[PDB]
Symmetry: D2
């Protein structure tokens, strides 16, 4: 049987020792997985996803690269809370240097809730990890019988069991009662094709996210920059447009060396280059086909190796 | 024919006798078909991009729509507006217009100069919706891409697509295909005449800030809004309105200091429920439920023109 | 406590005597509902939804009107299979003469499946039935924490727990862990405002559904008409367009007195009047904002009281 | 500049030196911008509405796209096609074109004469996608409403909207905004060069009927298709491909008689799985999995040009 390691980041999502007790619990909740793979488990952290920090990210990614280097460790499944699951998977996607499957799975309902999604999500995540076709697909998310590329996925609804979507593309595969089928695959660089390496990095650059609205202000740009932000993701109106006042504030901070990346509050689509705001002239970067919270993870990583407007924009037009 | 007034908030959404406003005059030439259906009056309320929208433009606009709609000769009011913030303007007027006559906001995802410009058709369909019988008492509506959306539900969800507008929580209330208007549903949430908000004597809207949550969040943005004098704050939290621990304490501090903290979600749809993870009652917050951060901000500025009481404000979010 | 009757149409969807044993089972699976309402239960039928017939429909609707006439019967919940659930609810919506809530609920996963949606769907359906706001909303469907108007709902996916959508509008309300919220309501005539009455009707008119495709045929029109169809729903290409050959066949059958209603295979949108095909001249009716399977239920009902092209078209432009 | 050939299957999707086809000539005048990007050749393969499409037009088209793509001077091939059946044509060529050079199908939801006609912009974006580097080896694609859709996944899902096209099971593979092409994904399912289907020596496609299931279903439509000589039948069943009992027995009879019965679903998305309610193996049916009834029909006519074997045909549905 394939050996797989489940890394728990908090509590149980679903209902001898795999290693972590949290993982032994899940294995009791779903005795089913044991006929599928040899499961070992570790407790990477003990938090809720809304408490996650860059430190936990580094910890995880580094631990994931270790596990994946071992010839007898076929894949790694990370049980994660849903709130920030898309940020962690995206990070890992640009930071894990392996062709082996890394599957993040979670649950919209407590395991103690009637009709808890967790058990089937776990059963399905495990079948995807050990599936020959998941190799080279990059980091993926398994929720509600669907398989999403980590670049494309976002949590679009607050409570629905089907809260995960890939607004710009769509899921890449499906897994129904453990049967896995892939129809597409990402074409943008991930994992072994990523230029970022976080072994040696211990702290990530500060990057704040600003939310645009009419009658906007300049004090939040100011406070982020005075608090030491290296980058600022501006979730702008429509096609990444800012209120004239905050634009002035964003132009001053870019001259002060803070990298200002224009995103959008909108929810989907690309925040294009050469639309209404002139980024070359003002010194901003356009985040293109990425939301504010994922554009931030990219900006943090970009900042660990550069701060040139042209080079960062190239990264956004690349990943 | 019915008399319709068109209030221009910026420039021509279609194309590149004087109705009253030059912009309106270029629209009428842009697509003449509109003249065979209504006697149009045009009026320039402001000349800006929707990203430059401000509370004062909002106040002037509403006050004007109310003067126009009191007139028997005026059947409807169409507002050409930029897309970026159309949803906030529409939502504001919806809790602020005291008439059941239709108030229609229309725009274009592409420049009038563009090839396959969407503005002409949206304008034409918009005149049809304004003069249709079934549009009365439906509240303020947005007409874009052959669809009719309720003001409370509409949001621009894509940066560039001609079909950028959606109502994620519900769906469009009707359709308009080459002038043919049909309604299939209607908002059961109070609006217009049934709204308790009256902007008549208001010169200024209170300041309400919106903060975007993420892992490794901070408390400096909360404090700045506080110092900058925010009367209220919308927190687009993680998942079901969840704050990062550090930023929750900062928020708790602002609520003690009298700033109204309303929890929303950066997620995009769904409700930021009560009785979820955060104890709002104990922390002194208010859950905005089925509203995105930006419309939750418009409801809060309004609420604040009347009350700062947490219970009342919660009730307002649970009603509108 | 409100009294409510659950009418079972087949087996258990979820996990003293309410009446039907199927209903006693559900009550054991979800002891929760018993603090909510006084439940009585009946077994209207013992079939899978793909076996449903017009006879079962009449039976149900007639039984529903009876129950709803009783002052102490607050609402009726019908546990139904998902395949044809939209056809039954639509029928009932135009046939139940009451202002009381009629809620259809089902399950995409077996109750014996891990993460079965049935228990929470039942818990939620019961909270909606007894909710003061569900009165006058017409017949509704409760699936996956959502409330759909019966006119608008369709099963859009074969396996997803979230397979129910209202493609043209959207759900009208939500029910999360029993908390119910309505945001919209239908504006098209239902229940007490419907002109149809099925007490006295014992058999419904035959109406076949044809599927359009390039290189289409005329033998299926022919066989439906020779088999005695009174109406034929043509699920056409795009905006209800037919292949020239089958159009000829459809024009001959309309002259032979079969009512031909143009719908679409497309999935959403209105199959408009005065688009590419001239219905007046050819004698067809345009089904407008309705799919093939729901346009068929309407045509059957229209046929119980008329067969004039103008009057039927008015019904399609009405309901 | 790159040389692109435009094959017109009907009329002008935009607008109301000779490229080679008059229609193509009107397109070039409709939007000149296209001439600054490629040297265009035009060609009228047929002049019909897409609802009149037939198997023979499909065969001629493919055979021609293959002659064109063998030529070194030909960089891509754009096919203007009516929307109604664009998805079947695209899917056919996708399992039938032996070249990795891009094959792009474009159309318009509105008449070229219409106000805010979508055809001009779609045409322009379509030329950009055909001449872009990343389009090679992506398979046949449809370009509509600023989006690039894989042929296997595309379907017209709304009767009138300019954004009628979607890929319900996956999503668009990329986007094209004012000529700027980006790809975010690609089909992992075999197409074009990797397809085992070769139409070169084929004069006719076998007859495959599609039946629509519903409660109180019948057996007379199954028998008629049988009598009419159907070689295969697509059954758009209820939910997960479920037939009404009566019609299942009729279908079982056709499978015994050598007609290939392939179970699909009228539902609209999802897969018509195996190991579901019907025992296909025992009944002799084939499950079409993640394919709608109409594309499942195109795959089956193809399969049938090679085999009638149930196992093989199932494998083909499980692969493409």
């Amino acid at each position: 049987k394939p050996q797989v390691t489940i890394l728990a980041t908090g509590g149980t999502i679903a209902g001898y020792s795999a290693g972590a007790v949290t993982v032994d619990k899940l294995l009791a909740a779903v005795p089913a997985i044991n006929d599928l793979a040899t499961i070992k488990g570790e407790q990477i952290s003990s938090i809720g996803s809304q408490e996650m920090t860059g430190k936990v990210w580094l910890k995880l990614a580094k631990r994931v690269n270790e596990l994946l280097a071992q010839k007898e460790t076929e894949a790694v499944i990370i049980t994660h809370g849903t709130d920030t699951m898309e940020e962690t998977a995206f990070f890992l996607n640009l930071t894990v240097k392996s062709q082996k499957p890394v599957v993040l799975v979670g649950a919209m309902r407590p395991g103690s809730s009637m009709s808890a999604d967790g058990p089937m999500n776990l059963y399905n995540a495990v079948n995807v990890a050990i599936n020959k076709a998941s190799t080279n697909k990059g980091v993926v998310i398994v929720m509600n019988d669907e398989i999403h590329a980590a670049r494309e996925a976002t949590k679009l609804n607050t409570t629905a069991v089907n809260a995960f979507a890939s607004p710009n593309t769509g899921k890449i595969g499906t897994v129904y009662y453990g049967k896995v089928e892939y129809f597409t695959q990402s074409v943008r660089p991930h994992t072994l094709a990523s230029e970022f390496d976080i072994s040696k990095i211990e702290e990530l650059p500060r990057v704040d996210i600003l939310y645009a609205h009419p009658d906007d202000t300049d004090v939040l740009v100011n406070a982020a920059l005075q608090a030491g932000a290296k980058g600022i993701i501006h979730a702008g109106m429509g096609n990444g447009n800012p209120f004239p006042l905050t634009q002035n504030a964003l132009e001053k901070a870019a001259k002060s060396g803070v990298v200002v990346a224009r995103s959008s509050r909108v929810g989907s689509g690309s925040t294009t280059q050469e639309a209404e705001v002139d980024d070359k002239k003002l010194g901003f970067v356009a985040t293109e086909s990425l939301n504010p919270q994922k554009a931030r993870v990219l900006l943090m990583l970009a900042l660990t190796k550069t701060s040139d407007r042209e080079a960062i924009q190239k990264i956004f037009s690349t990943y």
